[PDB]
From a paper:
In addition to this ionic interaction, our previous study has identified several residues around the Ca2+‐binding site as important determinants of channel activation, which is manifested by a profound decrease in the potency of Ca2+ upon mutation to alanine (Lam et al, 2021). With an overall resolution of 3.29 Å, the final map shows well‐defined density for the entire protein, including the bound agonist Ca2+ in its principal binding site. In this structure, the disruption of the L647/I733 interaction results in an incomplete rearrangement of α6, with the helix adopting an intermediate, partially activated conformation. The described change in conformation is accompanied by a loss of the density corresponding to the Ca2+‐binding part of α6, indicating that the helix has become more mobile and that the interaction with bound Ca2+ is substantially weakened. The single‐bound Ca2+ is in a position similar to the lower ion in the doubly bound state and is coordinated by two acidic residues, Glu 705 on α7 and Asp 738 on α8, with no coordinating residues from α6 since its rearrangement is impaired.
A similar mechanism underlying channel activation also applies to the ion channel TMEM16A, which opens in response to an increase in the intracellular Ca2+ concentration (Caputo et al, 2008; Schroeder et al, 2008; Yang et al, 2008). TMEM16A mediates important physiological processes such as epithelial chloride transport and smooth muscle contraction and has been proposed to be a therapeutic target for diseases including asthma, hypertension, stroke, and cystic fibrosis (Huang et al, 2012; Danahay et al, 2020; Al‐Hosni et al, 2022; Galietta, 2022). The protein is a homodimer, with each subunit containing an ion conduction pore and a principal Ca2+‐binding site that are closely apposed (Dang et al, 2017; Paulino et al, 2017a, 2017b). Both pores act independently and are activated by the binding of two Ca2+ ions to the principal site (Jeng et al, 2016; Lim et al, 2016).
Author numbering:
A (entry chain B), B (entry chain A): 117 to 130, 165 to 259, 267 to 466, 488 to 651, 683 to 910
The structure:
Amino acid sequence: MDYHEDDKRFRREELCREAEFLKLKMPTKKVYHISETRGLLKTINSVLQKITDPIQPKVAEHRPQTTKRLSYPFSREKQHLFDLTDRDSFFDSKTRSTIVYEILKRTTCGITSLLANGVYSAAYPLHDGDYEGDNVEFNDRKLLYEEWASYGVFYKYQPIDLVRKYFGEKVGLYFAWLGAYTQMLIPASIVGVIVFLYGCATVDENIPSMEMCDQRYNITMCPLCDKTCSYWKMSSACATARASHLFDNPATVFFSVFMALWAATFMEHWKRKQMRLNYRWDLTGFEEEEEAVKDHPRAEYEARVLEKSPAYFTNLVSIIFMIAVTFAIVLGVIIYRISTAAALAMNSSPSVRSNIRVTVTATAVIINLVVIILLDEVYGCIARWLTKIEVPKTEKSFEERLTFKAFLLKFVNSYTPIFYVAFFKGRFVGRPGDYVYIFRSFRMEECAPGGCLMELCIQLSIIMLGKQVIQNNRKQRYEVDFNLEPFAGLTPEYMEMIIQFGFVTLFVASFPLAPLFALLNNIVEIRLDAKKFVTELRRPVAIRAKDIGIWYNILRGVGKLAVIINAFVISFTSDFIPRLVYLYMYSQNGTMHGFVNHTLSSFNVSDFQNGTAPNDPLDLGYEVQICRYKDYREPPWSEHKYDISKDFWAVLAARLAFVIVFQNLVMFMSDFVDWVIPDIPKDISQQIHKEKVLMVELFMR
Amino acid sequence: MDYHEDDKRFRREELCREAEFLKLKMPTKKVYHISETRGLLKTINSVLQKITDPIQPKVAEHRPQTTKRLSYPFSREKQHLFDLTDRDSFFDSKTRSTIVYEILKRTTCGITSLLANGVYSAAYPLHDGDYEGDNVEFNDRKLLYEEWASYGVFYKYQPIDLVRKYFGEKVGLYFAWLGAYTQMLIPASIVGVIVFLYGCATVDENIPSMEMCDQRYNITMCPLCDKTCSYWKMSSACATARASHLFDNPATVFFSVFMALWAATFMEHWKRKQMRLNYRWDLTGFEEEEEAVKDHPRAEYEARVLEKSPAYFTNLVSIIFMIAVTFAIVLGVIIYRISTAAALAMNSSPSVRSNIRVTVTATAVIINLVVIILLDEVYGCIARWLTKIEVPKTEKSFEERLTFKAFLLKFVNSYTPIFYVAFFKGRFVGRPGDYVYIFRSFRMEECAPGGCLMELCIQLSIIMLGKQVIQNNRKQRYEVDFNLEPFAGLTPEYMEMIIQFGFVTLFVASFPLAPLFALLNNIVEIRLDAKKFVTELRRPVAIRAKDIGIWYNILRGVGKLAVIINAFVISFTSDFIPRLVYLYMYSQNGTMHGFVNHTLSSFNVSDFQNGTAPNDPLDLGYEVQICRYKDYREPPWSEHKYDISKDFWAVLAARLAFVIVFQNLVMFMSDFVDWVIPDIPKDISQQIHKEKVLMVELFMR
Ligand SMILES: [Ca+2]
Ligand SMILES: [Ca+2]
Ligand SMILES: [Ca+2]
Ligand SMILES: [Ca+2]
């Protein structure tokens, strides 16, 4: 049981002599202000860095950090830059660790240069006591384990003041943002359940659904593949049409508008909440610019350029990153294209005879998700290498550029198959008179029969649930925390949340119960992150932060892109605009009767291109003469046959007009939601006004 | 010649006794810190308010206001909140007037309550000396008259430090913004002249222009009016087609993109320039919130609601303002509709026989501009009355709400005829088989023959030049400034500049030399505003300001609306998308030959509706059987005649797709221009860093 002390570093004790000299030179600089104690356990030494009482005001004044006062107006104690009070244990462990880390970073041979050189293996603070220990005494770690880091306390609120008090305000800000996201997902999940129940309660009487599942019509569709498969009855796929209505009803369009407004309201609710937490924790912006130490490779680079005496190199690095992003996009496209074929071969190998084209698609999206998880680490390493060779000036810019590059790579390799299936999947394929052949021998495949909106939503389901699947399916203190996993950072924990937010905002024009899945994921992910921070990972160094930072701009950009993505999803891949066009232009009775016969276009089977027709035309029991495809083209009994008709141009014009109306009106409503809701709450403003006039009154006398 | 003194107020000296008692009560409160001297000239007294030396540090410390320091690092003197230096005339006239006005506003019976009550006619400062006076001694007013307020010094730069030193920093900020606007209009004007010369150098060989001005084709167009006029040859209007190419060439589309980027660049340049001027003048944000005195009607309202013991009343006021704005819109539409008819009757009264339909349109837009100038004051008074009955809490919110209401009313009544001619002018009229009749007897008019883009640009020309036309076509001091016109405010001077900016950004997709007209207007308007501020108007009270305020948000909103307005102008009223559609879909040779025959649609003259055909079908010398209109409809020799064909839907789909592409790409490029250009300049940041570390170093010792 070590005494009350602070951040400790780990040495390498058995060139080696130069490393030992560098390991001993800095403690000689630490003699004046840091106490030390060495320890041997079996073969490797370690050192301790307890700091003394008079040096806490020495560093707490040069770096301005807040301190609670004595007076309590309205039973709420005020704060000040420094207050001197006896029984000096009021400096909690996070403040002491921050002061010691600032001492380590300021004193040169910074501690990061010695850690990257290799003379120091690690430098971590120690957790206060132990969690779930026998006969422990009022531990903050134990309190956070029993009240916050438990699966049986998931419904209760989280002690955000306690997690700020223990793991600092960056981890506190992350958990407050995650709690705000989880709390805002509840009304979206409720409305999503309502919309899904509306879809389930209407699909029985949905007129296209009954027209497409009806027998005695005997409509024979076009083969949709090469000479391997053949003509298929449309009714044989209309069970997909029963699943199709649950995702493209007008309630889903209202749901898209509601989630645009919900993303806006969440953005300014978090904008107010971060100012509320800034009022609660620290409003001092005295941490001024150009105070962090520069990078040692940056120092070497500037020494080199002053000896040999930039923007061009940084522009070249950004260009290389741009072709890297384009390569990632085309790589994701080709990975999805080969993964669906690999799943098709795997399912056709033992002749399972599913005859549903859903289990094979689930296998395809599962192996695609596996490959995406495999290349996520590759893209992270590529982004880190690209950012390190640019050698930014400070650590903050280094972290922000690494964050930007990693987020763009995660965005492209996590949304490339979904953007491929949603938009560029079965539109560029031509008429059955003549198809388009990529590499002059392979046809570009059409999507799922009866509508690949079902394919899009099951890919969304599997990819969103895969993140849940991969997570759900005599000794002294210093060696115990040495056995613990080191703390990496909040950046990969923000990455998955931002990707989930992209799923929630970008693709609920096709999946109304995505907020429900996101809420069910976040409910257990809050407790998993709590258990990981309390039990497994080492104590974070509690770096000071004011707001979230770059991820707020990332959320704003995702929300702005979600408007145009949702508009394009509703217009093009949702098959809702053609229903409106048939209802208001071609109905002739005011009802949606004959919509399926209007959408389908005839094709004479004598006009295939060089044996593309199937080898078995008698599989249906009759010799079919005309198949029906879906492209809005002229019938074969016309003067200009297999040509684009007026209906295609009318439907396309209506789709583009709806994109214009949706995008403009939804951006205007989001701007109105931004304008109405103030950034600063009125109560926080009157409280900070009262606090500043009360401190002026107190310091007047 | 009065001595060195400050702001003086004007009394009413011959109930009257109560007014006299209120006029004498407040000078008794002025005895302690203000000196006074009374003066009679013929019948009315006046008072003087020279302030004493010890009161200047008393008020200059409670309200933190700038004071130059003695030391000059890099030949630039620093700034501190207060410095004590002998020869106390370093406090210039604007600071003394501001201190005296703050004294007047703080001391109760505020000075605005006594001025609105009626006991005080005016309260104005005196100009330092006189301009252009004989044997004057280094006057700032004289220096600004010969160096800034003159028409012979228009090419030189303006002394922005001197105008800040004399009329304060609000007038300085207005003149700096006007100078930045004039300087940024120069490259836009150069590119506009280049684009206009490109249009002039191509119109000779423009294939639609030669096809439309060619003889021997003998195309007879539809009557385009009621039974009054008759069929007209298209060539008889193709001189308008020679003017039409100068405004809808592809250089104009590139010009629209260039002005979107130019508006973004101007916004970021002014954003940097206002921070530069903030560094030069004052960076202190110590003027905290809730320090201004509340309104007396607001005090009466809160006293009433506390005695009798809001959001509903404010919402009702905003609703009344919304129906007021809608009424202004429909009023502007009907004013244009009756003004064109009034001009037509006025021109047809003496039988001028112009036969050009341009002089009558110029008369229509001139009288429309006259009516708009007439109702601008009406809308300003309506906005002031609507804002005053809402009784806002402070003066700043009162001015901002009055500004918002006045700007919306100015926007609607200044852009309603232009938005009417651009978009809703000749599109809702039907085919010549059957027209639409408003009020069941009057046809909705078609616009000018050969293209009403010419009508739109001549209306833009006249409305933009009308603001230039209405502007170009033994005694002591206190009585001299009493004879001068009182200072109203910078709000009406900002209104015309914002309307000019709306003209520059919203409508250069149809008028490429609008920045040239704006530059030629601003060149003389800077000098007229300078002469008005120096010679005619009284001295402003020099209220402190940091940025412009609401007008920056207004400029941002105008620039954001300009993207979609320009996209709709290029797609719908520019006739550029149909040229692209004919070139890439119907050309059959790759050239623009037969475009006029493709756009025009035939109509049999046997199919007019109830005598709508003209009374004189033999005016052209032949009995015409088929006229040609412009609606993309099926020919009469068709199974479905006079019906919308495939070409209309294709052209409409291309127009909407171009609106989508233009809006999305142009907003992305504007966001990229905002993102690349930093808000704070790097040199200003390094200088404020150097200044703060040097003041820390000085105050350390
Ligand atoms: Ca996590
Ligand atoms: Ca807001
Ligand atoms: Ca003016
Ligand atoms: Ca910027």
